[PDB]
Curated annotation (Swiss-Prot), chain A:
Assembly behavior: Binds to host ACE2. RBD also interacts with the N-linked glycan on 'Asn-90' of ACE2. Cleavage of S generates a polybasic C-terminal sequence on S1 that binds to host Neuropilin-1 (NRP1) and Neuropilin-2 (NRP2) receptors. Interacts with host integrin alpha-5/beta-1 (ITGA5:ITGB1) and with ACE2 in complex with integrin alpha-5/beta-1 (ITGA5:ITGB1). May interact via cytoplasmic c-terminus with M protein. May interact (via N-terminus) with host bilirubin and biliverdin, thereby preventing antibody binding to the SARS-CoV-2 spike NTD via an allosteric mechanism.
Portion of the parent chain present: 346 to 394 of 1273
Function statement: Attaches the virion to the cell membrane by interacting with host receptor, initiating the infection. The major receptor is host ACE2. When S2/S2' has been cleaved, binding to the receptor triggers direct fusion at the cell membrane. When S2/S2' has not been cleaved, binding to the receptor results in internalization of the virus by endocytosis using host TFRC and GRM2 and leading to fusion of the virion membrane with the host endosomal membrane. Alternatively, may use NRP1/NRP2 and integrin as entry receptors.
Domain of life according to the entry: Viruses
Protein name: Spike protein S1
Organism: Severe acute respiratory syndrome coronavirus 2 (2019-nCoV)
From Swiss-Prot, chain B:
Region described as Integrin-binding motif: spans on this chain: 9-11
Function (record text): Attaches the virion to the cell membrane by interacting with host receptor, initiating the infection. The major receptor is host ACE2. When S2/S2' has been cleaved, binding to the receptor triggers direct fusion at the cell membrane. When S2/S2' has not been cleaved, binding to the receptor results in internalization of the virus by endocytosis using host TFRC and GRM2 and leading to fusion of the virion membrane with the host endosomal membrane. Alternatively, may use NRP1/NRP2 and integrin as entry receptors.
Residue span relative to the full protein: 395 to 442 of 1273
Complexes and interactors: Binds to host ACE2. RBD also interacts with the N-linked glycan on 'Asn-90' of ACE2. Cleavage of S generates a polybasic C-terminal sequence on S1 that binds to host Neuropilin-1 (NRP1) and Neuropilin-2 (NRP2) receptors. Interacts with host integrin alpha-5/beta-1 (ITGA5:ITGB1) and with ACE2 in complex with integrin alpha-5/beta-1 (ITGA5:ITGB1). May interact via cytoplasmic c-terminus with M protein. May interact (via N-terminus) with host bilirubin and biliverdin, thereby preventing antibody binding to the SARS-CoV-2 spike NTD via an allosteric mechanism.
Protein's recorded name: Spike protein S1
Amino acid sequence: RFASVYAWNRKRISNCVADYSVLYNFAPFFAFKCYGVSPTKLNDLCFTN
Amino acid sequence: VYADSFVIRGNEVSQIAPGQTGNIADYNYKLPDDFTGCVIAWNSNKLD
């Protein structure tokens, strides 16, 4: 269950290895818009938080 | 002059554009940014 938009669910992600292979295997993806990055070049950068 | 032609779904016509990302512009028809052509797209019901 997802919370509604007035009280939106927030989560901080701790340190790990982040395979974005998953997250691609979900849906026909009506919107997939990165802004500061590009999805074709997502598996090489290493964000802090 | 290169005439390319196909059929796509109704809510997909916005994807036929230079510099886009979607399930039809990933690896079916990628339009480059050096695009000097013209995209014509019309409704094809009853024939198709």
